[PDB]
Amino acid sequence: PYIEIFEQPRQRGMRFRYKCEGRSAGSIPGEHSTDNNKTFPSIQILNYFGKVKIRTTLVTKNEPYKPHPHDLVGKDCRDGYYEAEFGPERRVLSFQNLGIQCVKKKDLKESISLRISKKINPFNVPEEQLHNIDEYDLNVVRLCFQAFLPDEHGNYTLALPPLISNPIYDNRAPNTAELRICRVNKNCGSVKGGDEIFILCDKVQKDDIEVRFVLDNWEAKGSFSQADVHRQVAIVFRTPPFLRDITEPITVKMQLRRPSDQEVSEPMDFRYLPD
Amino acid sequence: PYIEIFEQPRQRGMRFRYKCEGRSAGSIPGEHSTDNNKTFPSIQILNYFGKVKIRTTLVTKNEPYKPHPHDLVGKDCRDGYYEAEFGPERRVLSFQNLGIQCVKKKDLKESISLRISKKINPFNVPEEQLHNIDEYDLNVVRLCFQAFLPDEHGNYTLALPPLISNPIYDNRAPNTAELRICRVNKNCGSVKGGDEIFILCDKVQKDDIEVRFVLDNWEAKGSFSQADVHRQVAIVFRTPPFLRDITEPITVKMQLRRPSDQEVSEPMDFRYLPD
DNA sequence: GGGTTTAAAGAAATTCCAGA
DNA sequence: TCTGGAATTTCTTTAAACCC
């Protein structure tokens, strides 16, 4: 008797809304989820068939998961966390309306004290280790599913192991935003490589970013310095040479990449040409 | 005697700082101010020689000059205005440390009530008129010099006419900002005109901006819609054809321009080439 | 001539608010 | 409504100062 995540929540593309931004802090989507046939984070209770209760709470991306300041808002959420009873019904439990409301940095402290003075601690993490405000990440959280089964006749106390979902990063924050190449001025260049390209893109961090050409076992970096990143939304760089040379146009894949976590943007075709 | 401005304050390129930003709201420089030989807003008392006092305060850009909410901070500034004495000494009066602290839109009201409950009203502008909150531009102010001469044996009461300087636009705002082309991908194209250019620039407003090519009586606009403006700091457009054809390379002047006020950025050479 | 109070450029954190 | 360009307010690497 344990819990299992059927479909993990998408990690990029969702903004954490502030309280000042309405009540719909959004609805976190699933991984697979598509525009047409969209899906939602869902889990299933293996080794069990019966009435019960589940509690979705937000936790850190840190090895020893401690409650997070941000709130989970939406249908069946109160006090920053979702809780609901579920029947022996369909195996898969989907959770549609699950938004993330983020607290202003000021609220950060006050916020965690209440998680303590509330019992919200699915991992019984050392209370004092929990006041470790200076070190947390308000740009990324994790969903902590906590299913409690029926006790010796009566309510739900038999709690199953707290399962934790993949991390979800706030797309509004520069260091967690999804990588996206908006526009380029040239989709091809010489194999000698040295062509100067202008990439318009979503906010990145000149500190932690790199354009990366790739094909099979081959891969090279676009060539540019930090000064070439314009107001975080544009990169002026030069194409790297291709290994060897060729006689016919050879298209490779070009893409933004973030070293720190190696996250990459959707690729784009770049055709190398014979001199 | 009265007061003449020996040097007007530069109108563009200075940010209005918030209180949260510290004690230094910068230092307003005067037009003539070069880089190796920088200058400052200065005025001189004509028709007079002797000890005295002067008071620099901020006023609106509206015909009837009323005190402005923003504060003037810096050496000898207090309660939002600068005041100082000055013996019969040197004619010219330069004011270096003169910064502009801007109030949050919330503070706007509360702010003006205190200018009233303070006497700050160099132009004796009517009461309920000086309450035109929803008509004050927080992006532009004017310096109001008010020199007071010595009275019949005593201090300074003989107040000379309030002089007002040229406007000073809050570079924090895009429509009051200085226009600046940071970088371009091509400095030349065909006279047929149709070459796609990427301009990296300082924050502009897609709503109110246009690239203008010009030479003598000739002038044409770069071609692009709003969607071509990337996050306010980059423009992808196409060069306009040059009038007639040409035998040799003919360089013209390229520059960002803001229709609403016809303010323009510093020009840049664009050479048209014969097909 | 390059090393450590500070203030401009620059990125961040909010709050705004209308287009899709 | 949900999404996402942006005007606003805050604060961090730089960038007017000093160190001597």
- Residue B148: its H or E element: strand B140-150
Please list, in sequence order, all residues whose beta carbon lies within 8 angstroms of the beta carbon of residue B63, skipping any fewer than 6 positions away.
none
Do both B9 and B143 map to the same domain? Answer: yes
Domain boundary among A146, A172, A198: A172
Residue B61: strand, helix, or coil: coil
Q: Give the CA diameter of chain A.
A: 80
If you search the block for the tokens 């299913």, which residue do you land on?
Answer: A147
- Radius of gyration (C-alpha) of chain A in whole angstroms: 23
Do both B127 and B70 map to the same domain? Answer: yes
Backbone angles phi and psi of B111, in degrees to 5 = -60, -45
Do both B145 and B255 map to the same domain? Answer: no
Region of B80 (left: φ > 0; alpha: ψ -120 to 50; beta: rest) is left
Do both B91 and B168 map to the same domain? Answer: yes
Least Cα separation, residue A239 to chain B (angstroms): 14
CA gap B101, B209 in Å, rounded: 28
In 3D space, the residue among A23, A33, A21 whose CA is nearest the CA of residue A13 turns out to be A33
Tokens of B205: 């407003």
Alpha carbon distances (Å) from A146 to A3, A57, A208, B109, B157:
8, 8, 36, 50, 77
Count of CB atoms situated within 10 Å of the CB of B77: 19
Residue B21: strand, helix, or coil: helix
If you search the block for the tokens 């004619």, which residue do you land on?
Answer: B91
In 3D space, the residue among B184, B173, B60 whose CA is nearest the CA of residue A230 turns out to be B184
B153 secondary structure, DSSP code: S
B110 secondary structure, DSSP code: H
Do both B102 and B206 map to the same domain? Answer: no
Chain B residues within 8 A of A198 when measuring between CB atoms: 185, 198, 200
Residue B129: strand, helix, or coil: coil
Please give the method by which this entry was determined. X-ray
Pairing of strands B188-190, B268-273: parallel
Residue A259 lies in a domain: yes
CA gap B271, B171 in Å, rounded: 31
Give A85's strand partners: A53
Do both A240 and A139 map to the same domain? Answer: no
In 3D space, the residue among A242, A250, A244 whose CA is nearest the CA of residue A271 turns out to be A250
B203 → chain A, closest CA residue = A231
User: Alpha helices, DSSP H only, in chain A?
Assistant: 108-116
Do both A111 and A199 map to the same domain? Answer: no
Chain A residues within 8 A of B234 when measuring between CB atoms: 200, 230, 233-234
Residue A275 lies in a domain: no
Tokens of A247: 């006689």
Estimate the share of chain A in helix, then strand, then coil, as percent rounded to the nearest 5.
10, 40, 50
Q: Give ∠ CA A44-A76-A9 in degrees, rounded to 5.
A: 45
Do both B125 and B68 map to the same domain? Answer: yes
Tokens of A244: 């060897």
Do both A30 and A66 map to the same domain? Answer: yes
If you search the block for the tokens 């902590």, which residue do you land on?
Answer: A144
CB-based contact B95:B40 (threshold 8 Å)? yes
Answer yes or no: do B233 and A236 touch at CB < 8 A: no
In 3D space, the residue among B261, B202, B255 whose CA is nearest the CA of residue B232 turns out to be B202
Tokens of A192: 């000698």
Answer yes or no: do A198 and B198 touch at CB < 8 A: yes
CB-based contact B168:B254 (threshold 8 Å)? no
Centroid of chain to Cα B127: 28
CB-based contact A25:A168 (threshold 8 Å)? no
A6 secondary structure, DSSP code: E
Domain boundary among B172, B198, B220: B172
Centroid of chain to Cα A168: 3
CA gap B155, B105 in Å, rounded: 38
CB-based contact A240:A193 (threshold 8 Å)? yes
In 3D space, the residue among B51, B87, B86, B56 whose CA is nearest the CA of residue B74 turns out to be B56
- Residue A135: its H or E element: none
CA gap B11, A59 in Å, rounded: 51
Give B184's strand partners: B199
A229 → chain B, closest CA residue = B200
Do both A49 and A158 map to the same domain? Answer: yes
Residue B274 lies in a domain: no
Structural domain boundaries, residue A114: 1-172
Chain B residues within 8 A of A233 when measuring between CB atoms: 230-231, 233-234
Domain boundary among A172, A194, A229: A172
Residue B222: CB less than 7 A from any atom in strand C: no
B187 touches chain A (CB under 8 A): no
CA gap A50, B21 in Å, rounded: 59
Please list, in sequence order, all residues whose beta carbon lies within 8 angstroms of the beta carbon of residue A230, skipping any fewer than 6 positions away.
A236, B182, B183, B200, B233, B234
In 3D space, the residue among B3, B7, B76 whose CA is nearest the CA of residue B40 turns out to be B7
Please list, in sequence order, all residues whose beta carbon lies within 8 angstroms of the beta carbon of residue A260, skipping any fewer than 6 positions away.
A175, A208
CA gap B106, B19 in Å, rounded: 13
Tokens of B112: 């003006």
Tell me the CATH number at A134: 2.60.40.340
Pairing of strands B2-7, B42-46: antiparallel
Q: What is the DSSP annotation of B112-145?
A: HHHHHTTT--TT---TTTTT--TT--TTEEEEEE
CA gap B84, B77 in Å, rounded: 9
Give B142's strand partners: B59, B167
Please list, in sequence order, all residues whose beta carbon lies within 8 angstroms of the beta carbon of residue B154, skipping any fewer than 6 positions away.
none
B185 secondary structure, DSSP code: S
Residue A274 lies in a domain: no
Q: What is the DSSP annotation of A211-237?
A: EEEEETTEEEE-B--GGGEETTTEEEE
CB-based contact A28:A14 (threshold 8 Å)? yes
Do both B136 and B8 map to the same domain? Answer: yes
Answer yes or no: do A203 and B231 touch at CB < 8 A: yes
Tell me the CATH number at B180: 2.60.40.10
In 3D space, the residue among B90, B72, B89 whose CA is nearest the CA of residue B81 turns out to be B72
Domain total of chain A: 2
Residue B188 lies in a domain: yes
- Residue A257: its H or E element: strand A250-258
Tokens of B266: 């510093």
Structure resolution, Å: 2.8
Residue B275 lies in a domain: no
Least Cα separation, residue B3 to chain A (angstroms): 44
Residue B186 lies in a domain: yes
User: Alpha helices, DSSP H only, in A3-134?
Assistant: 108-116
Burial of A244 (0-12, 13-18, 19+ CB in 10 A): exposed
Give A144's strand partners: A57, A164
From the list A196, A234, A236, the residue facing B230 with the nearest CB is A234
Tokens of B272: 């048209």
If you search the block for the tokens 């589940």, which residue do you land on?
Answer: A54
Do both A37 and A157 map to the same domain? Answer: yes
Please list, in sequence order, all residues whose beta carbon lies within 8 angstroms of the beta carbon of residue B31, skipping any fewer than 6 positions away.
B7, B8, B9, B10, B39
A244 touches chain B (CB under 8 A): no
Q: What is the DSSP annotation of A46-78?
A: ET--S-EEEEEEEE-SSSS--B-SSEEESTTEE
Alpha carbon distances (Å) from B181 to A29, A183, B210:
41, 19, 12
